[PDB]
Each structure stands twice: as C-alpha cells, then as structure tokens.
Design a protein around this ligand. Structure first.
Ligand code: GTP
Ligand code: GTP
Ligand code: GTP
Ligand code: GTP
Ligand code: GTP
Lengths: 285, 285, 285, 285, 285
C-alpha cells in the first residue's frame, strides 16, 4: 500500500507519506532540561531533541544520531501509531559512498523509539534510495525532458549537477559550495567589524533585517559558481532547472541571467522529492 | 469557571485569581508569641506566620514549608471561603527538576489549614505549571513577538533568559545571579567597615537612605552580567524584554545601554504572570 | 460612649477614663489595723489595701489578687458611682501567654467590691487587650512612623522591644532586665557593707540622697543592655523611642549616646497608653 | 596535661574530664528561695540554679546565661578546686554561625563563680570546638568507617546528618525536628481533650505511664523523618549510625526498619563526645 | 626557572610543579556553613569550596568559576607562598575553540585569592596550552613513536583520538562518550527499578559494591566505541596507547581485545601531562 519519501537535505529534513512537510536539520543531544517544551525521542540509548542544537557542517549525516531525527521525520509524514511502511530514501550524490551499510542496517527491519512519549517501534517494508537533487528529473514533464536539461540543485553547502539527455543522464557533478560559503566570505570581514555573528545565525538577521548584505555580493557568488561550472557544462545548453532552497536565495538574479533556457522550479526546494515519487511509483506500481 | 496563577518568585510570592497581588517570601515558623499581630496558618502540624522570619537563599522553596505560604497566597487571590479553583503554578526554569512529585502531590486534591482562624480546607481543580520568567512570552504582543526576542527576567538571585524566534523558543539559560550578589559584593567591604549590616536589610537602608551605594557599582554589575551573557546571545539581536523586580534596580541605566532594541516591560515584575494567563486561557478556554 | 485604658505596668498601675493617673503596684492583704487611714476594697472574700504591702517581683500579676487593685484603678479613672464602661486593657508582651482566661473571666461581666465603703458593683462593656510597651506605637506621629523605628519600653524589671517598619512590626523582644537588676547588683556589695538596705527601698534613699550611687554604674548598666540588644537590632537603625519609667532613670545619659536617631518620649512613662488610645478609638470609633 | 569535652546538647549538658556525666539543660534564674536545696552558682552578677526552671526551646543557648551552667558542667567533669584545664567544646552544626565571638570571649581566659559556696575562678588552657553530632565520626572504628556511613544524631529538637565517605565528609544537613514535634503533634489533640499537659512534662507521664501514646504514632514520626531525608541521602547507602537520646525513643522500631546497614550506637547519646575525644587527642597528642 | 602543567581533565583537575597530584573537579559555591572543614578560596567576589558541589556535565569548564579551582590546583603543585611561575595549561581538543580569550585573559598577569586564609596573589610568567589527551604523544618513547600510533584518551565524558605517524599527526577525532554514557544507559533501567541512584554516585556504589554491574555491559560499551571509531581508524594499525581514567574502567577487557598492537599506558590517566612536560621543556629549555 503505502509509500514514503524521506529526504535528508542540507539544512532541513523532509518527509512525505501520510503527511507532508519538513523541518530543521539541527540536532541537540547536548543539555536538555525542559523535556515538555521540545520535540524529543529516545531510541537504543540515544536521547535527542529535534530541530535545535549542533549541526557543524559535518559529513556522515547518515551516521551521526540522525536516526532519531530520521525516525521523527517518518513519524511526521506518518500517523502517530504507524507500524509498517514502504521506504524511499535519498542521499546527496557524493554521500552515496556510504549506501550499502545503511541499506542493510535498515532494510526490512523494525526500530523502536520513545518520541514525545508515543514510544512505539515501527517496521519498514523496504528501502530504496535515490541521489538527492537527481530525483527532480522525474518531477520534470516531457515539456522539457524531451530536450537536454540540467537538474541544478543549489543546496546550502552544495551544488549538485545532473546533465541529462532525453530519458538519460549525460554527466554529473557536485561541489560543496553554496550560500554558506557566501555567509562565511561575508563574515570574514563583517565579523571582523568587531561583531559577534556567524553564518549560522546570519540568515535570521537578514530575515529580520537587523543586518543586511549587498546584492552585488550575491552577484559575485553567482559569477563564481558560473565560472566553476563552465568546464563541465555549457549552461546555455542543457536547459537548467534550479532546485533546492539556495535557489531561493537568488531567484531574483537567476531570472536576470543571460542564459537562453532556464527556470527556477516552482517549489524548487521540494521538486526533487516530487520526482523521487514518480520513481517510487515506478517501483511499487 | 475560575482560574488562578500563583508564582513563587525570588523575594515575593504572587497570587492572581478572584484577587491580585503579592507579598514577601519571608517565612517564620520559629518563635511566635503575638498570634494576633501576624498572619498565621496551621496545616498538617506545620504552623507558620507569613512574610517574616528566615529565607536564607535556599533552594527547594517548593518543599520547605512554603505549603502554608502557598495556600495563603491562594487565599489572597481567592475569597476567604473558597473550596474549588483551577490552578496555574510556576517555578523558575532550573527548579523544574522537581516538577513531577509536586504535581502529583497536589493534583486535584483538597488541603486543609487554620489560617487566621478561617480554618478551611480547599480543593483544587487542576494544576498546570510554567517556567517562571518564560511566561512573559505570552504577555508579549505581536508588536515584538513577530520578531526574535529575549525574555530576560532579572530576579534577585537569578537571571532567567529565554531567547525566542517567532512563536517558538530558540535557546534558554539561567544563572543564579542578581541584586543579591551585588549586595554581597558591596557588603564584602562596606560591612568590613566595622558595621553590622547584611544583604538582607541593605535594600531597606538604601530605601530610607541611611546608607547609599555608588551608581557606578550598579554599572559594574550590569557590565558583569552583560559579559556573562555574551557567549549565548547577541543582545542587540533578540530584542530584550526585561522582567522581574531586579530590572527595577537598574531601569535607569538599562535605558542607557547601547543596545538597539530593548525595553523594561511596564510592571516588568508582574509581566510573566500576565503571559502565564494567556497560557491559562489557552488551556481552560 | 465611654472608653478606658488600664495598664498594669511594672511598678505602678495606670488608669485613664473619666479620670487619669496612676499609683503604686504594691499590695497588702497582710496585717491591717487602721482601715480608715488606707485605701481599701473587699470583693469575693478578698480584702486588700492599695499601694502598700508585698510585691516580690512575681509573675502572674494578672492572677494574684490584683483584681481589687485593678478595680480600684478603674474606679480611679472613673467616677465613684460607675456601673458600665468599655475596657481597653494591656499586659506586657510575654505575659500574654495568659490572655485567654482573663478575657473570658472578665468579658462583659459585672463585678462587686466594697472599696472604702462606696461598695458598688460595676459592669464592663467589653475588654480588648494590647501588649504593654507596644501601644506607644500609635502615640507616634507620622513624623517618625514614616521611617522604621523601635518602641523601647524600659520598665523596671523589663525591656520590651518592638522593632517596626512603616505601619507594621518587623520584630519583637523582651528581656526581664531593668533598674532592679542594677539595684540588686549595687546591693550585692553596698549591702555587703554591713548595711540593711534593699532594691525595694533603695530608690527612695537616692531620692532623698541618704545614699547615692555612681553615675558610671548607670553607664555600666546602659552598656550591658546595649550589648544585650545588639544581636537583634542595630540601634542606629530603627530610630528608638524610649518609654516607661526606667527611661527616666537614664535620660541624662541616653541623650549622650552615640546613636544617630533616638529620643526619650515626653511623658515616656505614659506614652504607651497614649497610643493604646489611638487603638481604642480605632475599635470604638 | 588535662583534656575536657563539654557538649551542650539539646535537653542536657554533658561533661567529661576528671569526671564524666551529664545533667538537665533546664535553667532557673527566676524565683529562688531555698538556696541550700538546689545547685547554685553566681558569676558576674548572674545568679543561676542548675537543672530546673525555663528552657523554652530557644536558640542562642550559647549566649543566654548558660555560662553559669557551662561552668557548672566543667566543675562536674573537674574537681572542686580546679584552676586550669584544656577545653574541647561542641555546638550543633547550624549554631556554629555563632562560633567566633564565643571562642575569643572565652579563649585562654579565667572566669569566676560562686557555685554552692566553693566560689573559685578557673582559667582555661585553650578552646577547640566541634559540631555536635559530627564528632561521633571519630568514635567510629574502621569496622565501618572503611565504608561510606551516615552519622545520624537524633536530638530532641533536631536531626543532624553527616554523610561521610572513607575518612571524609560527603554532605551534611540538619533539620530542627525530633521527639518534641511528636510531643507537640500528640498534644495538639491529647491536650485538646480538656487536659492540662504539655510536651515538657509529657515524657515524664509516659515514663510513669500516667498517660501513654500509641506506637504507630512513633512509626508515623519515623516515616515522616524518612520522607524528609530522602532527597539528600539514600539511607540504604551510607550505613547509618544513630546517636543522641531521641534515637533511644525509637531503637525498638529503628531495628525494625527495612534498611540494609544501620545500627543504634551503644550509648548512642554519648557517642559523639566519645569521638570528640579522638579529636581531642589528635590536637593535644 | 620553574615549570608547571595544570590539566583540567574530565572528572578531576591536575597539577604538577613544585608538587604533583590531582583532585576532584566538583565545585560548590552553593550553600556553605562550615568554612573550616572544607577547602575554600575567594577571588574577585567569587567564593568557592573545592572538590564538592555541582558539576552537571557542562561545557565551558574554562569559564564557569573554575578560576578559583584552577588557582587552587596551581597552589597544590606550588608552595603556599608562591608569586611567579611559568604556565603550561591544557584543554580538551574540541574545547580549544575557546583558547584565545583565556590566554590573553591570563597571559603574564597576577591574580588574587583568599584560599584557606593564605590569601595571596600570584603572577604567572607565561601560558602555553596543549590539547588534553594529545600531550601523551611526547610521553611516548621512540620504542613506539618510530611506528604509527594512536593516542587514545578515554576520558569519562569523552574519547579523544590522535592518530599519528612518525613524529607527526595523521588525523584527530573526539566524541563526547565514555563511562558516563554507560552509567546513564545502566541507570535508564536500574534506576527504573524504583531506586534513587544516578550516574554521579554510581561509581562509588560499585566501588563499595553496594550495587554491581555485569561485565558483558562493559563489553557492550567497548563494542559500541569500537564500532564508532571504525570509519576513521583501523585499530590494528596505529598501535593504540590508552590514556585517561576511563581506560582504567576496562583495562581488564582492553587487554582481551583481538588487536595486534596496543597497551594501557602505566599511569594511563597521568601520561598526557607526562608528555606535556617534554613539550614544556622544549619551550622553556
Ligand atoms: N529566501 C528563501 N530561502 C529559502 C527558502 N526555503 C529554503 N531556503 C534556503 O535554503 C537554504 C538551505 O539549503 P537548501 O538550499 O534548501 O539545500 P537543500 O539540500 O535543499 O536542504 P533542505 O532545505 O534541507 O532541503 C537556506 O539558505 C535557506 O535560506 C525560502 O522559502 N526562501
Ligand atoms: N526599585 C525597585 N525595586 C523593586 C521593585 N519591585 C521589586 N523590586 C526588586 O526586586 C528584587 C527582588 O527580586 P525580583 O527582581 O523581583 O525577582 P522575582 O523572581 O520577580 O521575585 P519576586 O519579586 O518575588 O517576583 C528586589 O531587589 C527588589 O528591590 C520596585 O518597585 N522598585
Ligand atoms: N527618675 C525618675 N524615675 C521615674 C519617674 N517615673 C517613673 N520612674 C521610674 O520607673 C521605674 C519603674 O518601672 P517603669 O520604668 O516605670 O516600668 P513600667 O512598665 O512603665 O511600670 P509603671 O511605672 O507602673 O508604668 C522606677 O525605677 C522609677 O524610678 C520619674 O518621674 N523620674
Ligand atoms: N527512652 C530513652 N530516652 C532517652 C534516654 N536518654 C536520653 N533520651 C532522650 O533524649 C531526648 C533528648 O534529646 P536527645 O535525643 O538526647 O538530643 P541531644 O542533642 O543528645 O541532647 P542531650 O540529651 O542533652 O545530649 C529525650 O526525648 C529523652 O527522652 C534513655 O536512656 N532512654
Ligand atoms: N577503576 C579505576 N578508575 C579510575 C582510576 N582513576 C581514574 N579512574 C576513572 O576515570 C574516570 C574519570 O574520567 P577520566 O577517564 O579520568 O578522564 P580524564 O579526562 O582523564 O579526567 P581526569 O580524571 O580529571 O583526568 C572515572 O570513571 C574514574 O573511575 C583508577 O585508578 N581506577
């Protein structure tokens, strides 16, 4: 019956199933006093509280206590009393160097937890994993897949690039770059003011406008990434579909690019799962 | 029907219900001669007289004979012949490590007393507890909750800090510091004069002016607390709402701070209960 | 209509009503020959003669045949043909451990007597009792009650201490010490001369100067009492109002004290009743 | 040469030196007629008679005319013609807030008296003070000090608690509770019979059996104290050595407790001084 | 002249200088009555008592009142009248994110204190800081540094890992894991018995044997940590030198491991400072 996609993302984690949505990738298993005021889950001796704590730009998100979080995300797309579901997962392209163990450490198994006191264990019917960013391919319609295209997922730490022909990949790339390197470059001198701010809290302070950043620096980042991608791809060729949340940093300037064929996908951040679902049906149905 | 908040505070206890107000947290069950000249209550073998005696900076205010006092406070916000009320209580953030027992030692139970000869037992409809200092959150209007803020309760022994985003907490802290450590630092040398005075009676002697204290020492305390809070919070960020009575020590200098967005809440001392009441309705109504 | 205060004092008893004054607390129901030359009253089989006899420093002045005396005192403040009056009484702080019975043994009752042949019984409208020494509080004006003060009744056997804030008590104490312990300490060696004199007749012999006492011994007593009171009160704080007759032993040296704010109340001996009357009106009016 | 411990206790005072023993803590300097029939001592204008009078549950036993008594106790452990001895004293844990003055008001000084006409002044070689209740520690043998223990002095007004590891303290506590609060709770209704009896004379009437008390009320007191001590100590841990005279109220039920390791020390009342003596040697020898 | 290493450790703090040793990291500036019975120091308004109180697993040990403690530790390795010494300090690897301020808040400065009344201020000649755990490197002899090795400091909250080639680091890691997570996992169900015990007091109760723990659970913890470390290091490679006190939890099973080359360093707990001293000489000499 039931199908689910959980995408682990860069800044957020992502659930779609009986319910849809996402939430922050931040994790705390560090100090904890007010159990009742925070989302919480305990499993196999790991007690974690969801959407707050430490994130520290680390690799191995698929091994460092994300389990709880992942389970939580599945509970988000699922009901509070679920026991069996079929699983589509995703990981960024490069990180797939860790697929195997994960799969057999999860495949068709049941896992416990305490979350918020609901405290139930859930079995999974089957796991099938896709490259994060790539799955947007299937969300594409033949309106552009009939021609060569470029799935271009601007994630906050990353840019994942899938250069595709009609009904097939042509090339792939991924460079750990994105809005964080911009935040850090901006902080290299804005924090040198004598101010205590970081790339982690920066986006909030621009959201409220307590501090602001020049647009031409956004343009500098755009130019840098364009220069980086030139050797592999001719962006004018391979009509480019921008996905991920970092595309929403810059849609305003991306639309201003001199390129011939491109577009920031509506709900660009969530498009990849939208295609991962075409794939999900193609397996289960 | 009826709702009540009793906040146990640092120096005072706090009642709001059929009646509103507060009174000193001082307790005597030590010598007692003139029963008629003091507020008095006896319950379960504990005879206590209200607003005078020993306070001694002790933890466990929620276990050391405060019962009588607490009951008294409820009688203050209530009529003299009450028998059933619904209870919202509060405790400082850290002290919640003692919630559980208290709740089930009180939940939906009836308790006796002798107070001043009125000598009635009263049932409670339900208890629901909030972190003291945090509840000011709800007293906030969207005029500032729409932006990230910092509930900053300067209590006499404590500073409780709740760093909040729009409609949610971001971080929390609490350091047992306040006007008492200032009194003690001042007494470390002013009492070294060869004078018999203490942090307990000091505030009275400055109220009458029998002895006075330099303002720059208030500024030293302000600088010390600001240095203490720096690692967690950027005070310029998270527009700071000062609450509690110790904020009334220093409003005159707090307004002089170089911060961008801040304010000493009107009735800052009582704001936390004012929000605890938004919460009270959100449960009962 | 009518109000009366009878204060039982240490050495004297005290009447104010239709008439004002006081007289010695000495009692004789021991030998009696010349009925006509002494004040006399018989009631309920107790025949007593007023202002002479035995006093012997005994407690329970409110149970040992003072009745006659008390009645006499009421007759002093009253007319010789009185039948109904409203009663304010007073007892020293500690002695209130005996209030209850007295009250209901007197409340709203009529009592007979023979005094000097006038031999009438009188009803009392109501009794209301105050701590002797404390009532001086009400005789105070806002000129000093606006600040923290100390009602300090030096009675001959006692020092009663009421430490007050604005419009309320802060602490209380009472130590059975006074000019008698000075007389006894002086007699411990002056009577050791081989001389037949006692603390009872001593004050007369210094009044006529037949024997005299060094002032520095008065100062020794002052220093001793000051050392005794130190743990409870900072005399420089709580502006001290001296009351009672033993304050008139030492006014000359009390004015010489190094204290910041103090005063021997004019008519210090009678001030306590002067305030007991503010209280009397506050009940009856 | 000579060593002495005088322990001031709750109900009794305690002397060990050239002689050993104890006697009641009751004091009278109030009326006195038959000098010859009572133990008596006069010093510095204070005339007192030993083991009878007023006790009134008051703090400051180390300032309120105990001097005479204390001297008497030293005379008890000493000969009738002593002039120089070395002093170990003790006070309850909390009361040590008064150490300093006492020490320098006594240290290496000579003090007079009249006692019973022996009327000699005695010098003291040195004072060294220990927490009453704690000194039982040293009376312990390595048979249990090798393991963590709990010196548990049940004094009549108090329970003093010293939680110790091997050769060191771990925690301490003291709550003014004991057999008096039981007497008062029992009197709250047994005296409400319409009977004239008090906690002061109660123990005698149960000693002669003129009135008796249910054992289950002893058990109620035991349960109350056990509930009180739970937050600090796990009684099963820290093998508990009961000391003081109130432990002799209940040894019969203490032995019935479900605890794993505990014992009422033989001569439990006097054990603390027995250890204070190990300490005494460790100073003098 | 003089050199000192103070290592702040996980459970203890560590001093070597004119004197050597360590003591508990526990801190109390909370209630304090018996000043004389506890180690004590006051500096800049902070009064602290050493080796007892609150520890609460908190970060920022290098900012939360450890100053006093740190000073105390220096006094431990130093004489009681020291005024100038050269400083080598250490902090855990991760915590170095706080180096800078500490250094310049201490570098070449003089600091006061009251400790136990010795109450002297001491200057420091220079500070130089090393990663705790890493310094064991220098304590190594060429007998194993000639080959690739792994400094493996099992601290109670932590495992610090320094993977080294000949005369140089190859990689580093640190995971906040250790005997505490074992205590907490054991308490998750052993305290669920209905028993009042915690990870803080657990080790004592196993030291005295009042409660005991299965060895296979130690083996479970060992297996968990080994699984955790696999991605970074091949333990068979990089001959592993176990250091810290948590290595002394398990030496008995560590020796049983199937590894080819490893050893629990003699005085494993103190080895890191032993190498920090090779470094100390390499600076000063
Ligand atoms: N301006 C704007 N930025 C957004 C929005 N949603 C997400 N983002 C940005 O997305 C960035 C986070 O990384 P992403 O670009 O989303 O990369 P990702 O792999 O999709 O990571 P996930 O968000 O977890 O799916 C942050 O810089 C966000 O500010 C949005 O609605 N508006
Ligand atoms: N100057 C001034 N200080 C006040 C006033 N009201 C309360 N305070 C101060 O408040 C301090 C007591 O602790 P609080 O700051 O009130 O902390 P709290 O947790 O709110 O404790 P509670 O007063 O019981 O609610 C004392 O130092 C008081 O002087 C006021 O109206 N004026
Ligand atoms: N020198 C002097 N002493 C007075 C005078 N009036 C009363 N006394 C003293 O008062 C002492 C008696 O005890 P009080 O001090 O009056 O104590 P009290 O509780 O007020 O007792 P009462 O006199 O009955 O009201 C005696 O030592 C008197 O000498 C006075 O006018 N001059
Ligand atoms: N049943 C019984 N009770 C005793 C005995 N000796 C002392 N007590 C009790 O001890 C209580 C008095 O207080 P304690 O428990 O002795 O406390 P303390 O601090 O040791 O006071 P001291 O007796 O002066 O040393 C009273 O309730 C006595 O009844 C005894 O031999 N038998
Ligand atoms: N069994 C045993 N354990 C020890 C010994 N010494 C220290 N420990 C353990 O060490 C642990 C505390 O943390 P450590 O492993 O020492 O970590 P650390 O960073 O070295 O902290 P410090 O002890 O302060 O140096 C506790 O679990 C102790 O039981 C010992 O001699 N025997």
């Amino acid at each position: 019956m039931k199908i689910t996609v959980v995408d682990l993302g860069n800044i957020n984690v992502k659930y779609v199933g009986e319910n849809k949505g996402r939430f922050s990738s931040k994790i705390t298993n560090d100090y904890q006093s007010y159990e009742e005021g925070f989302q919480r889950v305990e499993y196999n001796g790991i007690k974690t509280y969801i959407g707050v704590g430490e994130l520290s730009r680390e690799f191995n998100k698929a091994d460092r206590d994300y389990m709880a979080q992942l389970l939580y995300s599945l509970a988000k797309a699922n009901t509070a009393d679920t026991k069996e579901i079929n699983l589509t997962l995703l990981l960024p392209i490069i990180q797939m160097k860790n697929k195997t163990r994960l799969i057999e450490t999860l495949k068709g198994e049941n896992f416990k937890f305490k979350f918020n006191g609901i405290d139930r264990e859930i079995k999974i019917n089957d796991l099938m994993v896709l490259p994060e960013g790539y799955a947007s391919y299937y969300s594409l319609d033949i309106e552009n897949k009939k021609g060569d295209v470029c799935i271009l997922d601007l994630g906050s730490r990353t840019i994942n690039i899938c250069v595709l022909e009609n009904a097939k990949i042509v090339k792939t790339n991924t460079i750990k770059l994105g809005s964080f390197d911009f935040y850090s470059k901006i902080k290299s001198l804005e924090n040198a003011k004598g101010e205590d701010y970081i790339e982690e809290d920066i986006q909030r302070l621009i959201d409220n406008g307590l501090i602001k950043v020049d647009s031409k620096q956004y343009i500098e980042f755009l130019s840098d990434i364009l220069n980086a991608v030139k050797p592999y791809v001719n962006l004018k060729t391979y009509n480019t579909i921008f996905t991920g949340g970092t595309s929403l940093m810059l849609k305003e300037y991306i639309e201003k690019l001199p390129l011939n064929k491109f577009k920031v996908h509506p709900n660009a951040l969530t498009s990849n799962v939208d295609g991962a679902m075409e794939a999900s049906k193609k397996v289960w149905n």
